[PDB]
Design a protein around this nucleic acid. Sequence first.
RNA 1: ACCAUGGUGACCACGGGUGACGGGGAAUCAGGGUUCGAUUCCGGAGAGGGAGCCUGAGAAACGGCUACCACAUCCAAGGAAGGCAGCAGGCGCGCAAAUUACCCACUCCCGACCCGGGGAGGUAGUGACGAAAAAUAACAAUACAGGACUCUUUCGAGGCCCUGUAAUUGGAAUGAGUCCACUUUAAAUCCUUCCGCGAGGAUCCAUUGGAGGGCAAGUCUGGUGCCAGCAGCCGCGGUAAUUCC
Lengths: 57, 131, 141, 185
Amino acid sequence: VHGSLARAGKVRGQTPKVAKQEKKKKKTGRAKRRMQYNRRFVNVVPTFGKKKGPNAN
Amino acid sequence: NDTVTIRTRKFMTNRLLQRKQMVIDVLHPGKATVPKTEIREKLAKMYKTTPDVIFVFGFRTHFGGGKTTGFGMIYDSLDYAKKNEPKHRLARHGLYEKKKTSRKQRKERKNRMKKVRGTAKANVGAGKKPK
Amino acid sequence: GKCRGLRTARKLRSHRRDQKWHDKQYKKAHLGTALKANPFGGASHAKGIVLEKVGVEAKQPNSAIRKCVRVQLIKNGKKITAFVPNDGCLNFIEENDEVLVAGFGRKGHAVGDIPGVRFKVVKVANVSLLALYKGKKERPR
Amino acid sequence: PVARSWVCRKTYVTPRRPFEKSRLDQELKLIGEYGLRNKREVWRVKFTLAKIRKAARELLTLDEKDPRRLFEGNALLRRLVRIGVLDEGKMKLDYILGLKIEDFLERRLQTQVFKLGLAKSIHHARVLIRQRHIRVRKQVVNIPSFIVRLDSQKHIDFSLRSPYGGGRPGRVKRKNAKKGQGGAG
RNA sequence: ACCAUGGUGACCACGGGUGACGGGGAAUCAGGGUUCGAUUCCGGAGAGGGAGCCUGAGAAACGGCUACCACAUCCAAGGAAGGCAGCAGGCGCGCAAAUUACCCACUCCCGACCCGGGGAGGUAGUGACGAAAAAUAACAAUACAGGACUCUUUCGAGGCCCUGUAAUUGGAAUGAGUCCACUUUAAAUCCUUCCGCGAGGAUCCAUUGGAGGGCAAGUCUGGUGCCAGCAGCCGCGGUAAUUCC
């Protein structure tokens, strides 16, 4: 119903909690300024798509 | 013994202080910082004097090795060297017995002699045996 | 029209010194009664104890019950309200605690849609409120 | 009360607005080309390039045969010739305003040790500075943003303590040798 | 004391408020300004609140005295002792602020004085108030994908450049850590010099926020169903949410 003062913490305490699974550690610092500069400017790929953004699906 | 250079620069004597003071740098290829007990004789075998007047200190070493540098001096007389010299640099190599009570206890003895007034034997023995 | 001449600056400096009162910011920061009006009194954070969890419904285009508490400060202990800006965190706070309150964000006015709120909740019982929200401290013994 | 210095100012400054695409990405192709650690040391050198052009805009509205133009201007002009950004004969007050930010990232130690071929792969030329190898004439320096001058531009080589300049190897040879004469002769 | 009846004022006196010590300055910056400056420099004021004095060249002194007010100690009940807005520390107010550490060796000061004193001052410990530098792998060999480089050709990969998957290794690479020895200092520790150590999921492992718009980045999957919530604003949410978890 209208949720007067009960169910504070209704949607967090019922949504499924998935284990944050481990990955490669991310390269930081000067390496992060290396590994994304190569992804954006030196590899201007001849593919089309009207400048498809970096987080595509 | 093998490869150490002891240059000097900016030497000025003064018979005011009766000392012979200069800047010393110590250039070594790849070894450690050589101690004073190896350097204060290397002027003694070059200024031909006794190494109980040569006082070296202040050796601060650059970034990257090679030249460390510092200050040094030579008194004229060991009799002079114990007159016009402060006792801290004079006792870095053994020439003086400096260990009294730590000052925080000597402060409290002076204020305790101050609260027992006038009696001379209780301005000495104001609690020597009660310890 | 305006009053110009090379001897007039008394007229300009006396016409100015009342006409600066009529905006909000010079009147709320220099008359002094708006320094008594906020419960903080020259501050940004001031502790207080929790009286009762009391909920308010949000304003017109929404419909939800925003959750609030009923803090009473220790310095100049007048009653306020305080919003707990978090999902489950009405259950992390409990009765008769000590909390910290801050501003709600835009200088003594409510943000979003809570009708008549002025303060938000940080650090219940000297442990951080978001650190109970992630799992970085627990409530003491 | 104290005898401390107290005089410490900031060296960079934040930009005017954030998040505009013709600012950060035209400056992203400088953080990646000359291989710098982060963008804090780009706002450093742009503010370094700014304050010279802050001085240089006063020196253009100062008239000719001016005391404080010719004194300050020549003294400025004899300071950026020796830093290598400006050549000798065409030293002027006018050619300093057309200067760009590229010509102070070139004059670091980190890429003047690359173009002398002492190391390849410009991100590696950061490392062999910081990794205690590469010297100014008698002074080895692990600082990548050393602004190398022009008199002392020819004496960059390996240090005489360096693995690539001397000997006395580190652990990685001495540990690989130890496993061969540790289970055998 | 005797006389004179005057003085100040809308050019803002008088009265009150000041969360006002005054200044040199700080932030800010087209120019005009705006706001703070309790604070390390100089000038003033006050050592619980008012008041009164002795001695001194110098005091209305409080690490001098006595009175009153208020707070407060010892006590055998007779009387004593007081005053941290000095340095360390406590309590209390508080969103809210350093160790009951070492030394006079350094900058100076006083004296009867080359000799003594110094919580002045310096050395440390806390310190993500802050400011200045700067780690968190680069190098590689296939290898995965592109290259104006190739045959008299969109023959096909490649004698050559950059990148990621994903390797196998490596060696005159290396610090932080562990720890000698010098060194610094009053004796130390710092930090620099230097042995010895010290890195294959370099496990010695980067966090704070955001992803509709302002505004750089997801209409990817799930849960939810105007509930929970998000959001500085505009908004989003009511069974397929690019905004909540």
